[PDB]
Design a protein around this ligand. Structure first.
Ligand SMILES: [K+]
Ligand SMILES: [K+]
Lengths: 129, 146, 141, 260, 184
RNA sequence: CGUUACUUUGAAGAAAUUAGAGUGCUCAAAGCAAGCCAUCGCUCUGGAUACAUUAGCAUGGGAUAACAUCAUAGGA
């Protein structure tokens, strides 16, 4: 069955970006996917995205700008303290200059740099670069 | 009714045959049933204050004191005389695989007649002195499953 | 995926986006409610009640008009079935297959399908006991 | 073991003694006395390692057997006598008096005090309860029992004891806003005022202390010692004034001193 | 002269609210459809706010159980009340209770009709009641703006044609969300 | 007068070992010494600090997740 809607969203976006598509439809929609997409948009890796209300689990239509190399989830959502962010970024990011690890923290869903800025740990949702 | 043993069962240091009986005095005085607050924010059940049972291992009317650990759990067995098995469920972290595994601990606890419990209830136990070979805890609060 | 087969069908109904009754629906709410009560009074189950209200009356969907579901309405007026309807139908299928096997011993295929049916019965009964829509000691034999 | 240990291995000695690793197989095991073995400074250490009066174990014995050293006004000849926090060490031949206080690094420092200031110590009240005959009595953490104490004195209080007369001349109630010194843990030797007391039923009680420069630290009740009523301690403090410094500021001080 | 409007608790009615009450009193028995239904009419609060479309708009609150009787007379009242205050697009929105989210130290069921979302969708349905919602779309712009797009029914277009900007301003103030309207 | 995981901060988690501050044992492995124009003495000389799974105690946070409920609310 659908176990992780975030994984399906990110994998569909990755496949569409590799295919050169300028729009990708995400189904189902979820608050975590909209929160991951907001981080992605804030760092400039995607453009407009549109939540389509269908009185069910929604749909998201995302504009793609060709700036994505890869986005994926980490499953399981391992507990990541502030001190283990360095090890996680070394494991998952292409360089110490670019790339983002997305964390779910009690302070909100945020990238690892913003998590360092507030000294808040949590669980890893995924990554994009 | 409570005298079910080959010996009379009395609360220690309570004089039942007192001549100057009085109900306005403190527990254990003038022949009054003795009872105590265990402390640690735990209310004394009213069936212990108004009970007729004699339990020396009761936290509220007996001689035991609650000191040390306070452990929550679930009633796993209640087939013994005034003693129940408390099952504690917890996650043991496995370092190498960064995962957890489910582990359980069976803690024998003495239960006083002021509580009636059934297998599956959520109980709160407090550490006391050794009461038997395997029992070091007393039931302090019982929350039914429903 | 089908729980007990490899079939991957996706045929189903699609409720309209508009959750309010269409303007052509004029039956008063109490009217549809007492119609449901009579329907359950002969012995119809909520699925059949919905089917009849859909194809023999101007009621497309009960929830849109009244604001409640058929089983909830029947529970309010004390006409809900004791055994839930899906479990009732599964038990009916199981007893039919059991009768057939009491006449036909060599039917190993029907024995396999009976095993599947009873597996479905145990699943649904476990769920209903967990949701307290069945007696805690309700047992199928 | 079949009884008490008589020897202290040098590696197993308290780390605030600053004993060196290769000085021998053994450290002076503190004798039983007013202070705990793990929280005291033995007399032999004070005389040989700290004051440099003696150079050897035997020389410490020679000094002490001359009856030259008084601890809190009384002559001690035991070398492993467990001298502890706030104890007065007086040598009435050189005319010098020392109060055993903590520096901000957790190590006992012999603080020179005036002759008048060596006439009292500060003791922390451990408990107040009725003794035999129904007589109220006080006991401290430095092993003293005082009968008929002031009824306003409770546990965890600080009493001022006149060594000459052996009576409570004044006392401080353990309240929020009193300057304190931490005597145990990682904040040993830190001085600040109590801001609040967080109590938890059945477990240790946490005290929140803020020093003069504004740094905040927390420690258990058993590691807090009141030293003054308000923001003015009753005793004189070592040069650090109980203000712990980070290693960066210590390096700043060292650089400034070397530059000068 | 103090009957049509009733503050939830005994609050002083703002002067504009008393003007609306006086208009209601003078419109009680004006017409045949103006009476026989205005008897069971009660208003909580009326406020007036300017809109970008150079006109002004007034909202009307409702105790939420006469809401439908209000809907049945909504079109006619909207006409009459607007005639009472020409240039003031009148909107009739019920009153719903938004409750704080339950804490971990609480076991309250917190009816989902009392949550902020369901309240806002009910409000947006009430504020454009002459039209019906066919579709809802939400755009997340680069600067973080969350602009909501609602598709109204193609029928009743002219009945809800020039109220679009006033509806946007009303939902901006009383709910706090950017909103645009389109027609399929 | 719902818990728990999770995370944050704090207190603990011996010393020695490890990492690491200072220090010219001639260097170094070390050690915890020492240094000062030379001083009947002085530098209050120094003798830091970090780390320390898991489990336990306490503080803040509630996104994620687990368990328990979840129309006799029959609520107040
Ligand atoms: K079908
Ligand atoms: K032994």
């Amino acid at each position: 069955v659908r176990v992780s809607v975030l994984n399906d969203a990110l994998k569909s976006m990755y496949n569409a970006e590799k295919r050169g598509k300028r729009q990708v439809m995400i189904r189902p929609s979820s608050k975590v996917i909209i929160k991951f997409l907001i981080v992605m948009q804030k760092h400039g890796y995607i453009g407009e995205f549109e939540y389509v209300d269908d009185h069910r689990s929604g749909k998201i239509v995302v504009e793609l700008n060709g700036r994505l190399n890869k986005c994926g989830v980490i499953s399981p959502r391992f507990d990541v303290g502030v001190k283990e962010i360095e090890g996680w970024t070394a494991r998952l990011l292409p360089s110490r200059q670019f790339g983002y690890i997305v964390l779910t923290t009690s302070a909100g869903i945020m990238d690892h740099e913003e998590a360092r800025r507030k000294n808040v740990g949590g669980k890893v949702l995924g990554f994009f670069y | 009714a409570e005298q079910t043993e080959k010996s009379f069962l009395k609360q220690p240091k309570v004089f039942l045959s007192t001549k100057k009986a009085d109900k306005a005095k403190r527990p254990g005085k003038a022949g009054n049933r003795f009872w105590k607050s265990v402390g640690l924010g735990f209310k004394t059940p009213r069936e212990a204050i108004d009970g007729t049972y004699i339990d020396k291992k009761c936290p509220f009317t007996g001689t035991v004191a609650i000191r040390g650990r306070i452990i929550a759990g679930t009633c796993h067995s209640a087939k013994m005389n005034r003693t129940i098995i408390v099952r504690r469920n917890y996650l043991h972290f496995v370092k190498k695989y960064q995962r957890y595994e489910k582990r359980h601990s069976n803690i024998p606890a003495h239960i006083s007649p002021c509580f009636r419990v059934k297998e599956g209830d959520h109980v709160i136990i407090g550490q006391c002195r050794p009461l038997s070979k395997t029992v070091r805890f007393n039931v302090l609060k019982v929350v039914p499953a429903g | 995926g089908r729980m007990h087969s490899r079939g991957k069908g996706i045929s189903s109904s699609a409720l309209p986006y508009k959750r309010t009754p269409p303007s052509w629906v004029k039956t008063a709410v109490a009217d549809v409610d007492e119609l449901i009560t009579k329907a359950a009074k002969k012995g119809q189950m909520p699925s059949q009640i919905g089917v009849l209200l859909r194809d023999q009356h101007g009621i497309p969907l009960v929830k849109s008009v009244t604001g409640s579901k058929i089983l909830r309405i029947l529970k309010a007026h004390g006409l809900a079935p004791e055994i839930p309807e899906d479990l009732y139908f599964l038990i009916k299928k199981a007893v039919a297959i059991r009768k057939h096997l009491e006449r036909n011993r060599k039917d190993k295929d029907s024995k396999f399908r009976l095993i599947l049916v009873e597996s479905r019965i145990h699943r649904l009964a476990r769920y209903y006991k967990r949701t307290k829509k069945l007696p805690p000691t309700w047992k199928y034999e | 073991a079949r009884g008490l240990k008589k020897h202290l291995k040098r590696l197993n000695a308290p780390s605030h003694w600053m004993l060196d690793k290769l000085g021998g197989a053994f450290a002076p095991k503190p004798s039983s006395g007013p202070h705990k073995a793990r929280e005291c400074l033995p007399l032999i250490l004070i005389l040989r390692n700290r004051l440099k009066y003696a150079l050897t174990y035997r020389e410490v014995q020679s000094i002490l057997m001359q009856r030259h050293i008084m601890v809190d006004g009384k002559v001690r000849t035991d070398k492993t006598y467990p001298a502890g926090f706030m104890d007065i060490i007086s040598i009435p031949k050189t005319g010098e008096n020392y109060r055993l206080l903590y520096d901000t690094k957790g190590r006992f420092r012999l603080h020179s005090v005036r002759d008048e200031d060596a006439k009292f110590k500060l003791c922390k009240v451990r408990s107040v309860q009725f003794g035999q005959k129904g007589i109220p009595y006080l006991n401290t953490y430095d092993g003293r029992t005082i009968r008929y104490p002031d009824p306003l004195i409770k546990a965890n209080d600080t009493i001022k004891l006149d060594l000459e007369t052996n009576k409570i001349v004044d006392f401080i109630k353990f309240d929020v806003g009193n300057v304190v010194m931490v005597t145990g843990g990682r904040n040993t030797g830190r001085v600040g005022v109590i801001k609040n007391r967080e109590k938890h039923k059945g477990t240790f009680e946490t005290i929140h202390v803020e020093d003069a420069q504004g740094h905040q630290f927390a420690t258990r009740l058993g590691n807090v010692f009141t030293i003054g009523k308000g923001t003015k301690p009753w005793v004189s403090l070592p040069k650090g004034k109980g203000i712990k410094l980070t290693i960066i500021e210590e390096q700043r001080k060292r650089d400034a001193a070397a530059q000068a | 002269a103090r009957k049509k409007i009733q503050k939830d608790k005994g609050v002083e009615p703002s002067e504009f609210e008393d003007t609306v009450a006086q208009a209601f009193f003078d419109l009680e028995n004006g017409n045949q459809e103006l009476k026989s239904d205005l008897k069971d009419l009660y208003i909580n609060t009326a406020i007036q706010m300017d809109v970008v479309g150079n006109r002004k708009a007034v909202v009307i609150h409702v105790p939420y159980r006469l809401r439908k009787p209000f809907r049945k007379i909504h079109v006619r009242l909207v006409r009459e009340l607007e005639k009472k205050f020409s240039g003031k697009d009148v909107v009739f929105v019920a009153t719903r209770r938004i409750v704080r989210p339950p804490k971990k130290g609480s076991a309250v069921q917190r009816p989902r009709t009392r949550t902020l979302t369901a309240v806002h969708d009910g409000i947006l349905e009430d504020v454009v009641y002459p039209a019906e919602i066919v579709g809802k779309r939400v755009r997340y712009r680069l600067d973080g703006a969350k602009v909501i797009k609602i598709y109204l029914d193609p029928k009743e277009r002219n009945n809800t044609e020039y109220k679009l900007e006033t509806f946007s301003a009303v939902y901006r103030r009383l709910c706090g969300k950017d909103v645009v309207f389109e027609y399929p």
